[PDB]
Structures are given as structure tokens and as C-alpha cells.
Amino acid sequence: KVMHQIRACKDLKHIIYYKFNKNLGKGPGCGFWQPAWRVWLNFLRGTIPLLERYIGNLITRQFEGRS
Amino acid sequence: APIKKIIERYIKSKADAWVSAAHYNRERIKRGAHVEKTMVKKNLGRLTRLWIKNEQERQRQIQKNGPEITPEEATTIFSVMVEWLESRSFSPIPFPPLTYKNDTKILVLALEDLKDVYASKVRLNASEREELALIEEAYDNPHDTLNRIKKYLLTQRVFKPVDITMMENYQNISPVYSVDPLEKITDAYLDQYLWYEADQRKLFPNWIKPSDSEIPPLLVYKWTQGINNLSEIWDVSRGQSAVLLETTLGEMAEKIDFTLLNRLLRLIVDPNIADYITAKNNVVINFKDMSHVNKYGLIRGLKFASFIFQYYGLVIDLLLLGQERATDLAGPANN
Amino acid sequence: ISYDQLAKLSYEKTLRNLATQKVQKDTKTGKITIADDDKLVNKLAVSLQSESKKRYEARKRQMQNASFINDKNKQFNEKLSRE
Amino acid sequence: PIYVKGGVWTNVEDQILKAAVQKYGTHQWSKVASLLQKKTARQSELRWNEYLNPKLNFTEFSKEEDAQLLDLARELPNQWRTIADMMARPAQVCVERYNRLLELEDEEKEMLAEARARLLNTQGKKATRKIRERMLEESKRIAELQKRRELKQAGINVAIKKPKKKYGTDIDYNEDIVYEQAPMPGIYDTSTEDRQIKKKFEQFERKVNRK
Amino acid sequence: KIPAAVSNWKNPNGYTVALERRVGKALDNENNTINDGFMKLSEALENADKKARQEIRSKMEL
Amino acid sequence: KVLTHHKRSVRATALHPKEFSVASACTDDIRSWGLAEGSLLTNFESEKTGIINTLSINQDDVLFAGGDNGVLSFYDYKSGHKYQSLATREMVGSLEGERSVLCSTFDKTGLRLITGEADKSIKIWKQDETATKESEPGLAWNPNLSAKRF
Amino acid sequence: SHRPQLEARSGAKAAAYTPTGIEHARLLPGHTTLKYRKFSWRKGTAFGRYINDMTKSEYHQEFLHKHVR
RNA sequence: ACGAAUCUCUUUGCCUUUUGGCUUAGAUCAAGUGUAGUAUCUGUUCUUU
RNA sequence: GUAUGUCUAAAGUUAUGCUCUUAUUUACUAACAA
Ligand SMILES: O=P(O)(O)O[C@H]1[C@H](OP(=O)(O)O)[C@@H](OP(=O)(O)O)[C@H](OP(=O)(O)O)[C@@H](OP(=O)(O)O)[C@H]1OP(=O)(O)O
Numbered sequence A: 001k002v003m004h005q006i007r008a009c010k011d012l013k014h015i016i017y018y019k020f021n022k023n024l025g026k027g028p029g030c031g032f033w034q035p036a037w038r039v040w041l042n043f044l045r046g047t048i049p050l051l052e053r054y055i056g057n058l059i060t061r062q063f064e065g066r067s
Numbered sequence B: 001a002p003i004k005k006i007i008e009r010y011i012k013s014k015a016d017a018w019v020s021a022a023h024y025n026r027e028r029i030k031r032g033a034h035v036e037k038t039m040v041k042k043n044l045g046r047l048t049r050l051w052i053k054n055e056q057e058r059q060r061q062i063q064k065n066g067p068e069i070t071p072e073e074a075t076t077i078f079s080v081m082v083e084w085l086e087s088r089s090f091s092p093i094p095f096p097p098l099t100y101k102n103d104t105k106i107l108v109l110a111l112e113d114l115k116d117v118y119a120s121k122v123r124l125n126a127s128e129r130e131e132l133a134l135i136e137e138a139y140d141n142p143h144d145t146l147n148r149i150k151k152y153l154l155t156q157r158v159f160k161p162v163d164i165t166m167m168e169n170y171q172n173i174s175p176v177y178s179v180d181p182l183e184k185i186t187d188a189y190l191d192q193y194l195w196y197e198a199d200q201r202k203l204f205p206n207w208i209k210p211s212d213s214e215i216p217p218l219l220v221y222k223w224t225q226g227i228n229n230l231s232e233i234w235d236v237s238r239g240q241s242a243v244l245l246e247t248t249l250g251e252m253a254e255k256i257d258f259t260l261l262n263r264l265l266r267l268i269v270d271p272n273i274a275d276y277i278t279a280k281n282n283v284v285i286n287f288k289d290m291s292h293v294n295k296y297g298l299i300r301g302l303k304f305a306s307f308i309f310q311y312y313g314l315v316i317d318l319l320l321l322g323q324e325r326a327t328d329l330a331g332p333a334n335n
Numbered sequence C: 001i002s003y004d005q006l007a008k009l010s011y012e013k014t015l016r017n018l019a020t021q022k023v024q025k026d027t028k029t030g031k032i033t034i035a036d037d038d039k040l041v042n043k044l045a046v047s048l049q050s051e052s053k054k055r056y057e058a059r060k061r062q063m064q065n066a067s068f069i070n071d072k073n074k075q076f077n078e079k080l081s082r083e
Numbered sequence D: 001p002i003y004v005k006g007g008v009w010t011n012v013e014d015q016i017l018k019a020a021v022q023k024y025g026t027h028q029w030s031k032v033a034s035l036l037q038k039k040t041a042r043q044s045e046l047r048w049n050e051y052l053n054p055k056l057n058f059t060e061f062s063k064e065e066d067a068q069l070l071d072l073a074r075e076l077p078n079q080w081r082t083i084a085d086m087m088a089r090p091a092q093v094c095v096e097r098y099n100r101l102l103e104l105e106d107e108e109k110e111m112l113a114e115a116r117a118r119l120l121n122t123q124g125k126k127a128t129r130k131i132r133e134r135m136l137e138e139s140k141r142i143a144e145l146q147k148r149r150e151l152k153q154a155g156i157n158v159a160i161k162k163p164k165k166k167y168g169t170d171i172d173y174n175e176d177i178v179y180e181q182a183p184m185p186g187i188y189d190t191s192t193e194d195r196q197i198k199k200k201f202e203q204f205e206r207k208v209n210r211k
Numbered sequence E: 001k002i003p004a005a006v007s008n009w010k011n012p013n014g015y016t017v018a019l020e021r022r023v024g025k026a027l028d029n030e031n032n033t034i035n036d037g038f039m040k041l042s043e044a045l046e047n048a049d050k051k052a053r054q055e056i057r058s059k060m061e062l
Numbered sequence F: 001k002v003l004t005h006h007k008r009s010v011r012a013t014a015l016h017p018k019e020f021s022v023a024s025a026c027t028d029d030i031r032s033w034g035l036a037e038g039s040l041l042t043n044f045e046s047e048k049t050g051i052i053n054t055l056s057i058n059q060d061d062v063l064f065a066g067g068d069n070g071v072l073s074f075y076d077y078k079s080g081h082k083y084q085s086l087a088t089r090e091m092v093g094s095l096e097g098e099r100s101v102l103c104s105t106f107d108k109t110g111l112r113l114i115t116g117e118a119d120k121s122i123k124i125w126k127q128d129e130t131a132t133k134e135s136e137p138g139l140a141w142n143p144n145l146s147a148k149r150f
Numbered sequence G: 001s002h003r004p005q006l007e008a009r010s011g012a013k014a015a016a017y018t019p020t021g022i023e024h025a026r027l028l029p030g031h032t033t034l035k036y037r038k039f040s041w042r043k044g045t046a047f048g049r050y051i052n053d054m055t056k057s058e059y060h061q062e063f064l065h066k067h068v069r
Numbered sequence H: 001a002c003g004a005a006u007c008u009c010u011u012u013g014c015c016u017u018u019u020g021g022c023u024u025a026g027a028u029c030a031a032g033u034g035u036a037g038u039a040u041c042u043g044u045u046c047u048u049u
Numbered sequence I: 001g002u003a004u005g006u007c008u009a010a011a012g013u014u015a016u017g018c019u020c021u022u023a024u025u026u027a028c029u030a031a032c033a034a
Helices: A002-020 A034-063 B002-031 B037-064 B071-088 B103-120 B126-140 B142-155 B181-201 B216-229 B258-268 B271-281 B305-330 C003-019 C038-063 C071-081 D011-024 D029-035 D041-052 D063-075 D080-087 D091-102 D105-119 D125-154 D191-210 E038-061 G012-016 G058-066
Strands: B163-167 B174-178 C024-026 C031-033 F013-015 F022-024 F032-034 F039-042 F062-066 F072-076 F082-086 F101-106 F112-117 F122-126
Touching (some): A002 A034, B002 B037, B037 B163, B037 G058, B071 B258, B071 B305, B103 B142, B103 B181, B126 B181, B142 B181, B181 B271, B258 B305, B271 B305, D011 D105, D029 D041, D063 D080, D063 D091, D080 D091, F022 F032, F062 F101
Antiparallel strands (some): F013 F022, F032 F039, F062 F072, F112 F122
């Protein structure tokens, strides 16, 4: 489902670059990492619960046997 | 008795669950939904068993309360067909002697047809292998093979039972009859001979489509042309009104009674051949551990069965058109 | 014959096997010491063993009496044939 | 040599087929076919259906039965399976009757030996393997005992190694009582009996030691 | 008292058993109500054929 | 407390509405039990009827029991009196073992019994409003006494 | 070898078993709160002028007819 | 002869090692060699019983 | 060729009709060669 996040980032890049490279030509030297960074933060927000559950159960199994 | 009752009940419940599940699956398959390859095979199996059960129940029904055909109806049919051939001066097909210059040629066709199954698939079953061997021997010993065939036709009226399966066209699963190779050769040769004799003798009138030696799109085109070329067909002036009637003769083969069929054939060919053919449709239909004597209903999957179907079709056609209009469509018998 | 009858009838039998030939309670502990004849209990033990032994040998004889493949099948066909 | 199946039913072969049918029943025709080196599945099943099955009959037809037959012929034209069913006979026989009315050993012994071997061998490989392992295990045990006993004779006392316990909560039952579900509490006193049985036990142990 | 169920399908233990106890049903006998109509039908055909035949010969002789 | 007064599967139980009791079924016997103390209340006259599937009691002390025979039983919950047998019908095509009432319940009214039968049928039953003590009385109750539970 | 079910895994043992303390997926709190209630040419022819069985239902036979050819 | 006990057999009663799931019968029935092993064959001779 | 399953991996628990010789088959097996 991280494909969504990845896709979003791609979209941002496409958007950003072509507002970043109006008169400027092509090349790699654009920075501006904000909105993508925002995306990743929100992905982490989404997943923090999921990983608390998942890894929770995992380490529980490591410690307590499986039910 | 109480136990027998209880178990009967519980299997009816289970059976109900099964059948309904199967039905649901087949609609699902039609829809084109996510469904397990394994699951679809399972459903095919279930539906086949269900079909067989249905079928042999129909056979039972047919037995238990007589044939669907009223004897008067049968008589009428006979009268019609008799009238037709009377009008045609149609000399019947003889039982094939040693006379023919074509005999060998005829044999070669059937063998070729049979071979067509086996040229592609290199890995072959035991039955398939046997069939191939028979074919090979037949090539080796043509006259002898012919003799054997003739003997069989004269004598053999009880055959090896016909195994079946269902090829899975995911709308409609199609039955596949598998005749035991030895009889299959006979069926082939007989079929080919019948077609050569029938077409030679002008049995089947022009109007019957599928066998015409013209391609289905070609056939369609011809039909269209015919429609156009009708004299002043498109006029709507003088209250002229055309109607085209497409319909399917439902279960046309699947309720041909052998008695009636036998007698009908005895009109068109030497009675021995008729007897043979009737006896071939009456086989035991083994499928996956369940069998039944196919007491009532033509089997499409014999080689010659097509001819029988076509001949039966002629009857229906005659019934539709009557003697006169049919006679016109055919034309005069001589030309 | 039900297990009702077969019990009483076997009861009647072992009474014929008998026909061949004190209570002290500490209520605080609840222990009801029935001091009875130690010779008679021994006579029960030997008789009961002998009864079970007689039955044990009875099967052994009937096992050694004789459309099958293995030990079990032969008997399984015998379970069908008795009907 | 590999080849296409067929031929003729030798009586021994027929008998073998019958045996197979008794064993595996009337719907596993592959297995039965396999049992016969010459004859096919289909062939076999057909044979069983047509000739070999005992719930058929080959007794001659009474005059009434003859009438019924020929009447059927008159009415059902050469639908001989149907006719057979009506008669309650197998079809070929019926047809024959109607017609009448109108007017090497080494190989065989090989398959026999193989056959009998099979029929008297009715277990999947899991079973066979298991019994094999059992007897092997037993052998191993006795060998171990022989070593231990030998050493005892020699004067070195070696305790027998435990079974390498498969899991943490795996039980040895000689350690302590399995799951001592005690008797129901005593209404009648049991103390002397407890003593006597204890003595008997200890005595038995002593006997074993001496044995 | 239920009979020991034996199958025509599946022995787990591979016990061979008698052939009568194996295969059964034994109820093909019926034959009577099935025929009521077939006689009429085949007879009808026979008579129809007769009529056609004699007719054909008659007309032929004209 | 653990009541055990049943030979067979206790496979149909029902609380009485206004009594605080519970009837239970076996293969034949249908006890009725007073669950304050954990005490028995009443044996019933179910001596020949089938295996009871369901056992819904009415508001008005009209204990129902559904037979694997197919026969709808009907009891006076207070006494045990089998005041109606009713052999059910099956749907035209069914087999004779299938007529088996596998479920049952009464409404709030108590004047409509609903029965989930194995004939894929949901049969419903009214009490006759044309009935009297002379027009359709019960089945002439008689405690049998033949080494019986009553 | 491989055998039918007779005496089910009775939740007596599962009761006396120790807790696991895992967090399954569905035991995550879903729908926390409960609801409550208020309280000439036509002459010349030859012929001129429910069941409770799933294997014998009109729907069933028809279905079979449809899905065989 | 009656009563009892012991033994053997026979008749019945008891089934006393006495079929422990489901699926599309769950599916599909082959073209092999030499080398070795293993077993099984069969002959083969002689010995003595 | 594998899943898989066993095995080993070192320290001493204090008691007084047959035997024979062969040649042939068939079967199965064989990550051995063709
Ligand atoms: O469209 P994407 O598959 O995500 O690939 C893009 C795209 O390259 P393509 O057009 O060849 O696919 C960009 O090219 P432009 O459309 O902007 O011409 C390019 O951006 P730059 O031109 O700014 O380099 C960027 O490359 P980069 O990631 O180096 O910025 C590159 O992404 P990928 O390199 O991941 O394919």
C-alpha cells in the first residue's frame, strides 16, 4: 500500500520540477523536499499503529510462546 | 427403516447444499469473477454428475410412463416422410457390398479424419494408442478391414460403453462422448459412406445449411443475397410485410426415440444399417463411476450421429413446410 | 436380553457359586473400619481370579477354532456372515 | 515388451479379476487393471459388467420369457441394452438367445504370485515404513540392553539413556505418577490396605532386583 | 442391529469380502408399466408401414 | 447444581416465560425443571413420541415439542398432559424422513407458533378460537403407571 | 491412517491454559458503544388445425438445459 | 432316580483384534536402456536322509 | 535432488527332504552411466 505513498511522491516530483524548471533547463539539482517529506510523515503516522500491533505480537511471540 | 429415513434426509440436505452451491458457482463463473482454477474444475465435475443424474432420471421417466410421442403423431410423421421420398423417387442406400470402386477411397477418408485427432498430440492414452494401431493395421490390410466392418454391421448390435466428460466452455459445459476405438472405425466408415451415398442420391435438399460445402460466413452471405433477390421483397407500399423467424429446435437430438428413428432410417437405407445405428445410440453411458443405458435420446458424439440428426432434421423441416412448399424449395426431383 | 436381565442372571449364577461352599466408626475422622474375615476376602480373590481365568481361557479356545486376506478380515467376514 | 492391451480372458486371469473386485470393489477399475498385466481398465470393467459379475444370470429362458424377449424385439427394435434391462439379463447373451430363437503358464504364474502378493499386502507405505522402524527400534533396544547387561556383568553399572525428549514439557512416566487422579476420599478406612499393598510393591521390587 | 457398512468405493484396510456383499441393488425387473405405450407405438409404426407399403405397391401398379 | 434426569442427548430446552423454570428434552422424556433451588418440577407424558428437536414454551403454559418423527406434540406445561398430537405434512416432493420440525418459537402473543421444519418450510400454528371443552377436548389424559415416571 | 472427527477439542484445556497476551486484528475495539431500544397455405401441414426436489425443480432442469449446450 | 460339584461338547446370547473423515470416484494411467544391488524365479549337479 | 526425520558429538554418584555348484527370468529400486 506504500505504492500510494511512492506514487504521491512521484506526482509531487513531477509537479515540483515543472514549477521548478520553467525557464531553468533540465537536470538533477533541484532540492525542495518538503511535500514529499510531508507524505512520508503521514505514511509513518498511518503505520505507527500497524507496527505497534505487528511488532508487538512479534516480540510477544519471541517472549511468550504463541497462543 | 428409521435410520434409512434419517440418512436419506441428511443426504438430501447435503445434496441441496451441493446443488445450490454448484448453481451459484456457475453463475459466478459466467460473471467472470475471481474463482479458483481448482474450484472451477470442481464445479465442472459437480455439474457433470448433476447433469448425468438429471439425464438418467429423464430416461427413467421416459421408461416409467411411455414415450413422449403419441403413436398417432408417429404415424403422421411416417406418412409425411413416406410422402416426401415418394415424391423424390429416392432410391435407398444399400448395405455396402464388395462392389465399390470408391470403397477404399471412402475408408481412406474416415481414417484420415481419425488421424486428424492424433497428428498434433504426440503423447497418447492407452485407448488412443489402440485406435492408432487399428488405423495403422487398416492401412496395412484395407480389404480385410472393410470385410471386418461389413461383418460388424451385419451382426454387432451391442457395443462397448461410451465414456464421457465435459469440456468446459465457461458459459456452457459441453458433453464429450468417447466411443471405444474398434466401433469408432465402423462408425467413421459408415458415416462417410452414408454421406457419399446421401449426397450422391440427393437425400438432403439444398435448404439444409451446415453441410453445404460452403463456409458459415459464406452461408450467411448467401442467405442475405437470397433475401435481397426475392422479387419485390422490400416494398412496404401495398401492405407488404416481411417476417424472419429464427428459432432453435430445442433438444432436437436429445428426444429422438430409437423405435421411430429406426423405422425412419429403414425408409432411407438398408434395414441392417438402421438397426446398427439404432443399436449404437442405445449404449451404456459410463461417466465417472455412474452408468445408464441411454434408452431414449440420440448421442451427438458418435461419428455418424450427425447424419442421423440431419435426417431427423429433414423430418422437422417437412413438418414445418409441408409436402408442397418443401417440394418447391427442393425443386423437381430430376433437376 | 438386556443388560438389566444379564446382570441379575449372572448375579443368580455367582450366588450358586457361593452356595457351593462387625462395624466400628470413628465419627470425627469418618473412618468406618469394617473388620471382617481375612480368609473370606482371600477366598473372594482366588475365586474372582479363577472366574476371570475361566473366561480368559474360554476366548482362547474359541479363537482357536479356525473369503479373506488377514486375521482381521477373516473375522470381519465372520461378522458379516453371522447376519 | 510394452504394447497395446486386449486379447482374451484366460480363466486364471478372470479369477484374478474377481479377486480384485472383491478386494477393491466395482469402482476402482484402474487398480484392478494394473493387477492384470495384459488387460486394460475399461476391458476389465466391461468384463465384470458383462460376464463375470455373479448378480447376472445365464440360465435359459422359459417359454414365457422367450415370448417376452421376442415381443420386446418386435416392439423395441434392436435397442438391446434396453431389452437386456427389461429381460433383467446381460445384453450379449440375450442377443445370442434371440438369434438362436429366430433360426505362457510361467507368465501367468508370475502375475499370480504378484497378484496374491498384492492382495495380501493392504497397507500404504507409511504403514510399512512404520512397522519397519518399529522392528528396527526394537532391535536397537535389545542391542543397547546387551551392551548395558554386558557392562553390568563386567562390573560397570550404566544407567540407560533417556529418550532424547522432543519438547520441554515431554513426560517420562517413571519419574513420577502420570497424572495422579487420586481415588475418591475414603468413607471406609483404608490404612491397613495401603500398608499391605506398599509391602507387596516393595517386595515385588526386591524380587525383581533378585531376578 | 445395523449391518457392518461395506462400500463399493473405498476400503481403508483392504479387506476382501464376498461379491454378493460387494455389489447389489438387484431391481432391474420392473419392465411392465414402461412397456404400456411402446406396444402401441411400435405396433403403430408396423401398421403405418404396412399401409404405406400396400399403398405404394397399389399406386405403382397404376 | 447439575440435573441429570435424562437417558439421552438433552437437545431441546426452553425457559418458561412467567414461571421461572425450564423444560428440557431427551429422546422421549421431556422433564420440566424449577431452577430456583435446582430442582425437578414435572415429568411429562412423552413416552412414544420421537427425538425432540425443539421445545418452545408458550406464554399460556402450552409447552411445545417438535418431533424427529415429524409429529408436532403439544403439552400443558403445568401438568404434562399431551393435549394434542399433530402429524405434520411435508411439501409434495419431499421424502418421508424430511418432515421433521427442527425449530420452533412462539410470539409475544402466544397465539402463533412458528416452526422451522426440514421441508424448507416455515409452518405457523394458531390456537382454534372455535374450540371448547366439548368441541375438541384433549387426549383424555391418563397417567400410565406401567413402572412409569408419570 | 487419517481419521474422522469424534470427540472435539473441548475448551476445558484452553480455559486452564495460560493467557497469550497477543493483540489480534479483530479484537481491536470496533463499534465501542452499544445501541439501545426506546424502552389455404396453413392447411397443407401434417398438423393443420412447486416440488421440493432440487433435482426436479423447473429452475434446475432449465438451468441444466442452458448450461450444457 | 433327585441335589450338588468337576470336565467335554452342541444350541442360542455376547461380537469378544470385527472397515475410524471430506473433496473434481480428489485427479491422471506409461516408451525406455545398461550397470549394480536386492529379492524372487526356474532349472543344474552331487552328497547323504 | 530434495522437503523431513533419526544419529554422533567424552568424562566415571560413594551397595555387598536337504547341502551344494551355478546359469536364466521377472520385479523393484537406484541423483550411478547412457
Ligand atoms: O517520469 P519518471 O519515470 O518518474 O522519471 C523521471 C523523469 O524521467 P523520464 O521522463 O525519462 O521518465 C524526469 O525527467 P523529465 O520528465 O523531468 O525530463 C527526471 O527528472 P529530471 O529531468 O529533473 O532529472 C527524473 O529523474 P531524477 O529522478 O534524476 O530527477 C526521472 O526519475 P527517475 O530517475 O526515477 O526515472
